[PDB]
Design a protein around this ligand. Structure first.
Ligand SMILES: [Cl-]
Ligand SMILES: [Cl-]
Ligand SMILES: [Mg+2]
Ligand SMILES: [Mg+2]
Ligand SMILES: [Mg+2]
Ligand SMILES: [Mg+2]
Lengths: 4, 195, 125, 204, 233, 196, 212, 222, 222, 195, 4, 196, 4
């Protein structure tokens, strides 16, 4: 999943 | 539990069920009757997980008997088998499913025909001329494929059944302590005492 | 390991170490084998320069290889024990794999093969 | 213990010229053990036909469920449900059980009574509608069916020719699958007549 | 059984009318840490071959030493070492491919993906791939890692099949490679801006370009992007 | 991510990179991680994109409802609402948030909220995967009561290094200035900050 | 698989199916599961296809070397024991084999040995091996007599494989029959289950479960 | 799947391929991955096919009711907000990856949504297994101030990159163009570059080839 | 943990006629969802009128072919340039495969040629050396799609003589080289439609007493 | 494999071993002799892992027979049991151990005494008046504790053995297809054909 | 590697 | 550990903390991680204490035997021997080593050898768990051709920050100076470097 | 074990  | 067989002939349904109850390395009982009368012309044999089997069988028995009293009428074998299937179909998606396999032998008085239904714990129903549950089928089915005829008498059915039990007693690893045999026909349910 | 080729050919085409081994057999006590119509008999000489012997415990000249085959010999006594031992082991090994005792021909062919191997192996006589 | 391959079975549907065909095998087993050779996997509600492969208990349950729902539909709507509408009903009902699904592979087939258009559709176990002009396949020999259909199929086949194509697709696919076979049934469906044919096939 | 420690990312390459082009960035990553920036991952062998390597850098340096030793060994008792009996790209590749497959078969692989680019003695272009599994294949365009997913699609628009190779010049080919390296910098999290590029031509020979940078990038549109949906300010 | 917030003489400035990651693939190279929860209360988001977005939206809702009843909320109040969500749902969240705001009474304030949901009021804060590489640099270079231009340079140089070493950080450097004057957005491109 | 072999007055009947399966995929319908070790010796194949095919051909080479060295046909006991001692050396490595070494010799007479990959070796009159063995046993046991004619015994072996082929999903294709005599083994044809089932159903009146 | 979205002068365009796969098998060679949420708000979906269809229909239904309730044309941010809050609630178990695009009174919009509930804004976006092939093209050829005809060309080129290079994508290219002040135009099978060649032989069987045991007329009437 | 195996996809097909044999295979090579090569041959002329293909994990496939080609070379050296018959090659390949029984070559192997009576021969192998002669065999990723079609068209299964009540089968006959190539081409185009790992190109090697001839045909590239 | 029993009486040792060989859900054989004669006055019965049992038994048999030929002399039961124990003790720390349990019944001609030794697969040796391996002991031991006397005759030992088999046939889960009984005494080894 |  | 080596005008300086860790317990607070393998070739050790000691001892042995036959070995040669051990035994070793030496021809040289056993020649190198926190600081502050006093200050300030943020680093800062003049050892205590 |  998209991480920052 | 373990061995339950069923044969539908011309005028009757014959159920054969093993007498052994084994727990661990001990045969606790050698005279166990793995069946319940649901109605005067309908008999259910059962096998599977300990406790679940009898609990399920008696629960079904109570419901069919309740129906009989309410309507003053006997449900057809087809109707009973559908009710039983639905209960198992509900059960399989429950928190703890009934791990019970059954055969339902009945004589339809309106049709004047014997009927044998095979239902597994998933709720998989089939009407058959002969049926079995567990490892029993792996020997009997091929034997019945050969020797079975649709126009057989009850006596011919019993001899055919003796042939199956003999094969199981020869090739099965476990001692199941023989079988109790019961016949379902127009006159109801009766037990063969000498088998 | 000791490798020397001890058994070798000579100019005239002889293997002297094999021929000299025959001279050791010629020195050994006499042994005779005669077979009849329904039996075989093995006779053996024992030299009489040895008195005060204990014949109970002294190694017998005829040895059982299995319950149905026997082996006698002439020549070096110590050498024969090695052949007898190998023969006895092979007899049991044959029973184990073929599920049948050895034939006399087979047992002979094995012993002879062991003897032959010692005529073209390095470091052995 | 893979629910979609315990009992075995296959269904295939095809379109032709002013007609549709749907076919299925008759086997029901418990893994290696063949148990029944009379287990039909195609059902119909009015003129709409539904084939279902997968776990047999769910096949039976869903048939009973869609009979239930199409009967109430007819009473309230005062008309028989159409294939396009029924397809949506199947999709909704399956997705309702998104995180506890029926382990099935349904196939809808029929002709719209108003427009006369042949219609077929397929679903995955959780409701995804797969519409197709040509053919839909389902079951333990779906790979085999895809191969047979893709090569044998041509558009606008007459009912009698379409029967041969769908029959040969099913039979030869079933014979390369251990868990399929033991007899077969083919439904040929025209605007206002339906013929049902049992096929002769190898019984191993 | 291994796990890679210091790693190099994509290697990309393609054929053109007279030869081959190959490129790779100068980064040695240590997991998410962009540890080493002066790492050369293109290694020339003679004046006719360039071996581009991705994956574990310790294993890359081992392969460098093997190729170095191969040149030495080929020169032994060989008066035509700089002529007819010089090392061909096909010889160099088959050697590496043999080693890679032998090492995977001993369950102790060289954790790399390798592309051998060069020109044969008869003028034919050579371009072939091999990896830690010993898997080999050839194509008009070849790329490793992220390059396989992002570069190949772009390079295949130029040379889509064999017949497109004579129609592709060195100017057009290099332009596509340089563009692909920019796209990899936009989208690969273990890539750097700095890279090396090599051209092996059948006429002009081996041209090795160091210290190239990705340039002409598009970032200005970022200022207009505010929030993640409903945000106005 | 690489994110930070720094208080200074006139107020506070928030800073962030613009990269979104799905594995080693950059899913978004122009992401906005500096997010408004109130006029002059903003936050820097790190960790899960979904979690931090969902939290920020809920906080914005709470502060909008707060404002309708009790007027402008303090920066401490905003940080408290973030904490409550991050603490009580610690088992299901991956959110590292820095809250920054400007009051007229309290001037510039910075609160950092790590994974556990604890709250820490600081003069400046750094967070995200890329922050690890600039703890040394930021500690040596930070001074209190810096000017706007000095603070912008401090953040620019800091995130420049964080981006240089962290593969999970990159793209543009976004900044948001919070002062009495208002709200100013700044952007800085690779060609500038890379060669610092 | 379903394979059987039994001893009777007229020698040994050997019957096998011809199906190979990779999971639920039917790989082949024409596999030779009787290995012709030599004109006098038959081996049946169940379990791993390669394991059985490779090591039973190898067995034939070892039997040939025996008769060259000993100037005499190998015994069924000795042949079976070469195979069993071989697989026992590999025990635990993951070989999968369920075989039956069948042959006729002067000293032993008609003999059948069951040999499997965990090292078991059993002399016996009747054996059924494979995933459909239980189906074959049922028909075989309920119909076997030592005094069966060569004609009847051939049918029973064929009918037993058919029973398994029908019920077992992983058995099918065709039936291969063999008769083993002193003089050696005689082949009794390949019988496709496709035609054999309907032929048996019609002529015998059995298989009433199936839609006729 | 390959899906893309591209903003242009006076609106937005989305596109998709038309292959659906179960494992390595192509289940449907011409499925529709472009969904309508509202007349002028369209959705491109990748991931679990049932989830994308179900979540787009549910939000599409609720958007219609919302539009009627408020007497206003639906906004893209409303569809975005409702989708993300639904997807977040289910913690990624609803495997819907979406590109949302459309026009409304506020203007023209383009978003993406991931299964866990995170959203992104952009002028060009790509999702699905062929997103890397598509994004490579978008990153190479995209520019500011695209025309309608340029955006359609760029979008369909990005889908083609996925069709040819990604095994998960194939068959045709669908397009939908949403321009401000105009009706949205859905271009089903805008490109069809994968037509099946003529077969070498007809496999039409002679009638009677198939063996038959029983025939019977089926009653469909009451 | 290191996994020494991979899957390179692709599919192969061998058919035997009266006086000829064909061995066909697609030219696509893949890993996961990516294409490695659109033209990477995997059907090889091994000398002595034997053609061979080992499909599955390409590294093992290349190693096996390499070892067999080498086996043919040494067979000539050791046995006075004697021609290696197809049956002898088959047995030799079994020993090559079974030699790695406990670390197998992950490939399905097929060889084709002419037997010693000049008749067409196809042999097929499992990964560990089980082998069998057949008229017909498909191997690889799309084997399950193609094989049931061949059963129906080559060996004429489930086809009965019209009007005979399903009593008499359609009788087996040898197919011409023209008819066989039609079936090969249609088999692969069908497999290309429904299997993602199959496409790009088709290469067919035909074996007669005159030698080995090649034919190439384009396939869909999506 | 499964059931092996042993009883040492006044003048003889009696071994009883089950005839069944089961693999999966099929009894492959019902006449299996689970014993080997090691020497004229020494008999070994065995049970355990398939293949290992016979391989081990025959290996021991070969070694004792080799010894007999070499020395023209029969090893005592005690000597044989120690040799067997050591081989199993070696085996347990090997790469792949023999999973075989044995009973050794012998008549010592020098002492004129019967002797019964129980050895498990670990190499655990004990001399006993009566012995068993596996689950058999859990029924027989308590039965023999009660009825066994040290001065019994061979006929009394056989009746005592019948009592054990009857108890096993009643309470054991598996059908072991009866037993082969062999007697070891001064005159050697003989088999009881009717049991 | 098929079974039998 | 926190370790580094820095080349400068007159040669090269090695630097290290003195902390050895067994869990969170400090097993040794006065450890010497700067290690002689030859007169003017030294190394900084990080990772497993046992592994790095065993490697250093073997290298020292190899270079002593090298010197007996071929005279003084180059710094590159020493680094190669380290590499050979670290690379070939990569599966069983946890050793991050920096090799530093002074030749008269080559002057000061630094080679870093990470976990995999790769070799990297650099102007300066940092390693150990604490190095992560000073990548930003060291990159911004390092200059080539520094003086002895400048290089000492650079290492002192760098390791000071590494120690401040890394729990696995601490104690005294040890240094070893390598020049033509000879070998000089330096030590710096907490009271000095903490308040930098 | 002791780490550095
Ligand atoms: Cl975000
Ligand atoms: Cl230390
Ligand atoms: Mg079938
Ligand atoms: Mg079958
Ligand atoms: Mg970066
Ligand atoms: Mg394709």
């Amino acid at each position: 999943a998209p991480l920052x | 539990m373990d061995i339950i067989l069923g044969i539908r002939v011309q005028d009757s349904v014959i159920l054969a069920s093993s007498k052994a109850v084994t727990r661990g390395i001990s045969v606790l009982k050698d005279s166990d009757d793995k069946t319940r009368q649901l109605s005067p012309h309908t008999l259910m044999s059962f096998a599977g997980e300990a406790g679940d089997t009898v609990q399920f069988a008696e629960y079904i028995q109570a419901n069919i008997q309740l129906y009989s009293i309410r309507e003053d009428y006997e449900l057809s074998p087809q109707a009973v088998s559908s009710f039983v299937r639905q209960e198992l179909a509900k059960s399989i998606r429950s928190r703890r499913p009934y791990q019970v396999n059954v055969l339902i032998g009945g004589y339809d008085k309106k049709k004047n025909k014997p009927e044998l239904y095979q239902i597994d714990y998933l709720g998989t129903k089939v009407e058959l001329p002969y049926g079995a549950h567990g490892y029993s089928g792996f020997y009997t089915f091929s034997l019945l494929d050969h020797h079975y005829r649709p126009d057989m008498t009850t006596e011919e059915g019993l001899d055919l059944l003796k042939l199956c039990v003999q094969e199981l007693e020869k090739r099965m690893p476990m001692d199941f302590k023989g079988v109790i045999v019961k016949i379902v026909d127009k006159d109801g349910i009766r037990q063969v005492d000498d088998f | 390991g000791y490798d020397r080729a001890l058994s070798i050919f000579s100019p005239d085409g002889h293997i002297f170490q094999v021929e000299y081994a025959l001279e050791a057999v010629k020195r050994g006590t006499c042994a005779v084998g005669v077979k009849g119509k329904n039996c075989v008999v093995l006779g053996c000489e024992r030299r009489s320069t040895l008195k005060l012997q204990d014949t109970r415990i002294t190694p017998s000249k005829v040895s059982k290889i299995d319950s149905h085959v026997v082996l006698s010999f002439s020549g070096l006594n110590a050498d024969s024990r090695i052949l007898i031992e190998k023969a006895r082991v092979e007899a049991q090994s044959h029973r184990l794999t073929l599920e049948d005792p050895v034939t006399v021909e087979y047992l002979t062919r094995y012993v002879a093969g062991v003897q032959q191997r010692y005529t073209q192996s390095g470091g052995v006589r | 213990s893979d629910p979609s391959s315990i009992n075995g079975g296959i269904v295939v549907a095809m379109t032709g010229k002013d007609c549709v065909a749907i076919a299925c095998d008759l086997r029901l087993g418990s893994q290696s053990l063949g148990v029944s050779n009379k287990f039909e996997k195609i059902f119909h509600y009015g003129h709409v036909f539904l084939g279902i492969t997968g776990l047999a208990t769910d096949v039976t349950t869903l048939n009973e469920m869609f009979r239930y729902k199409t009967n109430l539909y007819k009473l309230k709507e005062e008309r028989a449900i159409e294939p396009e509408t029924f397809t949506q009903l199947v999709s909704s009902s399956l997705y309702e059980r998104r995180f506890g699904p029926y382990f099935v592979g349904p196939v809808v087939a029929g002709i719209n009574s108003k427009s006369g258009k042949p219609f077929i559709a397929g679903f995955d176990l959780i409701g995804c509608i797969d519409e197709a002009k040509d053919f839909i396949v389902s079951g333990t020999a779906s790979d085999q069916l895809f191969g047979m259909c893709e090569s044998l199929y041509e558009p606008n086949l007459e009912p009698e020719d379409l029967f041969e194509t769908i029959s040969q697709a099913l039979l030869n696919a079933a014979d390369r699958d251990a868990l399929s076979g033991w007899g077969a049934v083919v439904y040929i469906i025209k605007k206002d007549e339906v013929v049902k044919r049992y096929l002769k096939m190898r019984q191993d | 059984t291994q796990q890679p420690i210091v790693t190099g990312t994509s290697v990309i390459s393609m054929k053109y009318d007279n030869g081959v082009i190959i490129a790779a960035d100068n980064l040695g990553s240590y997991g998410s840490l962009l540890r080493f920036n002066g790492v050369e991952r293109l290694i020339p062998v003679g004046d006719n071959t360039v071996v581009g390597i991705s994956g574990d850098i310790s294993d890359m340096q081992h392969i460098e030493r093997l190729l170095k030793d191969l040149v030495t060994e080929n020169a032994y008792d060989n008066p035509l070492a700089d002529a007819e009996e010089a090392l061909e790209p096909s010889y160099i590749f088959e050697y590496l491919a043999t080693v890679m497959y032998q090492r995977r078969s001993k369950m102790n692989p060289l954790w790399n993906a390798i592309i051998v680019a060069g020109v044969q003695s008869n003028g034919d272009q050579f371009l072939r791939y091999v990896n830690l599994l010993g898997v080999t294949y050839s194509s008009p365009t070849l790329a490793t890692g992220f390059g396989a997913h992002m570069a190949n699609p772009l390079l295949r628009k130029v040379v889509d099949r064999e017949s497109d190779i004579p129609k592709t010049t060195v100017q057009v080919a290099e332009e596509a490679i340089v563009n692909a390296m920019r796209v990899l910098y936009y989208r690969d999290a273990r890539s750097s801006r700095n890279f090396s590029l090599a051209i092996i031509d059948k006429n002009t020979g081996l041209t090795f370009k160091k210290n190239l940078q990705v340039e002409n990038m598009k970032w200005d549109f970022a200022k207009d992007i505010k929030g993640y949906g409903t945000q106005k300010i | 991510t690489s994110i930070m917030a720094v208080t200074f003489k006139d107020g506070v400035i928030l800073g962030a990179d613009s990269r979104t990651t799905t594995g080693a693939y950059i899913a978004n190279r122009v992401t906005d991680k500096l997010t408004r929860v109130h006029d002059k209360i903003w936050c820097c988001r790190s960790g899960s994109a979904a979690d931090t977005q969902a939290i920020a939206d809920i906080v914005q809702y709470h502060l909008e409802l707060y404002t309708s009843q009790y007027g402008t909320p303090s920066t401490e109040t905003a940080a408290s609402v973030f904490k409550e969500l991050c603490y009580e749902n610690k088992d299901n969240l991956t959110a590292g948030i820095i809250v920054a705001g400007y009051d007229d009474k309290n001037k510039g304030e910075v609160y950092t909220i790590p994974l556990g949901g604890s709250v820490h009021k600081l003069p400046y804060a750094i967070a995200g995967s890329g922050s690890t590489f600039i703890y040394g640099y930021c500690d040596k270079n930070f001074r209190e009561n810096m000017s706007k231009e000095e603070t912008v340079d401090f953040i620019k140089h800091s995130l420049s290094q964080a981006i240089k070493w962290d593969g999970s950080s990159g793209g543009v450097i976004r900044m948001v200035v919070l002062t009495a004057a208002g709200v100013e957005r700044l952007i800085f491109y690779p060609d500038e900050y890379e060669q610092l | 698989t379903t394979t059987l072999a039994f001893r009777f007055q007229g020698g040994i009947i050997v019957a096998v199916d011809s199906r190979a399966t990779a999971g639920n995929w039917v790989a082949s319908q024409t596999v030779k599961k009787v290995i012709e070790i030599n004109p006098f010796l038959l081996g049946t194949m169940a379990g791993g296809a390669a394991d059985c095919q490779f090591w039973e051909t190898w067995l034939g080479s070892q039997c040939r070397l025996h008769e060259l060295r000993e100037k005499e046909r190998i015994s069924v006991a000795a042949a079976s024991k070469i195979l069993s001692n071989l697989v026992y050396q590999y025990k635990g490595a993951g070989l999968s084999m369920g075989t039956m070494i069948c042959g006729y010799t002067r000293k032993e007479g008609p003999t059948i040995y069951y040999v499997d990959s965990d090292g078991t070796r059993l002399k016996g009159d009747i054996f059924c091996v494979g995933s459909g063995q239980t189906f074959a046993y049922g028909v075989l046991d309920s119909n076997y007599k030592w005094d069966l004619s060569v004609e009847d015994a051939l049918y029973l072996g064929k009918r037993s494989i058919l029973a398994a082929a029908h019920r077992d999903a992983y058995s099918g294709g065709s039936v291969n029959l063999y008769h083993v005599t002193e003089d050696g083994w005689i082949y009794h044809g390949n019988h496709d289950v496709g035609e054999l089932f309907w032929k048996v159903k019609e002529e015998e009146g059995s298989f009433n479960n199936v839609i006729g | 799947t390959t899906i893309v979205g591209v903003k242009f002068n006076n609106g937005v365009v989305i596109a998709a391929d038309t292959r659906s796969t179960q494992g390595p098998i192509v289940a449907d060679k011409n499925c529709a991955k472009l969904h309508r949420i509202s007349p002028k708000i369209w959705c491109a979906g990748a991931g679990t096919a049932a989830d994308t269809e179900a979540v787009t229909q549910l939000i599409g239904s609720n958007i219609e009711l919302h539009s009627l309730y408020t007497s206003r044309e639906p906004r893209v941010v409303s569809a975005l907000q409702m989708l993300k809050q639904h997807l977040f609630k289910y913690q990624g178990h609803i495997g819907a990856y979406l590109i949302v695009a459309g026009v409304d009174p506020t203007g023209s919009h383009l978003f993406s949504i991931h299964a866990h509930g995170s959203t992104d804004v952009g002028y060009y976006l790509s999702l699905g297994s062929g997103s890397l092939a598509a994004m490579a093209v978008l990153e190479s050829h995209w520019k500011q101030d695209l025309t309608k005809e340029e955006a359609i060309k760029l979008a369909s080129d990005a889908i083609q990159a996925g069709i040819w290079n990604d095994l998960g994508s194939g068959s045709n290219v669908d397009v939908c163009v949403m321009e401000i002040g105009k009706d949205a135009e859905y271009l089903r099978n805008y490109l069809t570059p994968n037509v099946r060649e003529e077969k070498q032989k007809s496999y039409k069987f002679p009638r009677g080839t198939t063996a038959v045991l029983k025939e019977s007329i089926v009653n469909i009437c009451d | 943990q290191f996994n020494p195996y991979g899957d390179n996809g692709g599919t192969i097909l061998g058919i035997a006629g009266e006086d000829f044999a064909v061995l066909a295979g697609d030219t696509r090579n893949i890993t996961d969802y990516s294409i490695n090569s659109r033209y990477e041959p995997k059907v090889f002329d091994c000398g002595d009128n034997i053609v061979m293909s080992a499909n599955g994990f390409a590294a093992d496939g290349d190693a096996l072919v390499k070892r067999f080609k080498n086996s043919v070379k040494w067979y000539h050296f050791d046995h006075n340039d004697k021609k290696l018959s197809i049956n002898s090659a088959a047995r030799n390949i079994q020993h090559l495969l079974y030699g790695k029984r406990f670390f197998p070559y992950y490939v399905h192997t097929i060889i084709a040629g002419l037997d010693e009576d000049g008749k067409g021969a196809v042999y097929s192998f499992d990964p560990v050396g089980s082998y069998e002669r057949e008229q017909c065999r498909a191997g690889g990723a799309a084997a399950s799609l193609i094989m049931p079609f061949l059963d129906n068209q080559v060996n004429f299964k489930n086809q009965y003589e019209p009007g005979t009540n399903g009593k008499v089968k359609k009788p087996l006959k040898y197919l011409s080289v023209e008819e066989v190539i039609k079936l090969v081409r249609d088999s692969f185009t069908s497999a290309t439609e429904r299997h993602i790992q199959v496409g790009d190109g088709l290469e067919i090697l035909i074996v007669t007493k005159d030698g080995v001839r090649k034919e190439f045909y384009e396939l869909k590239r999506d």
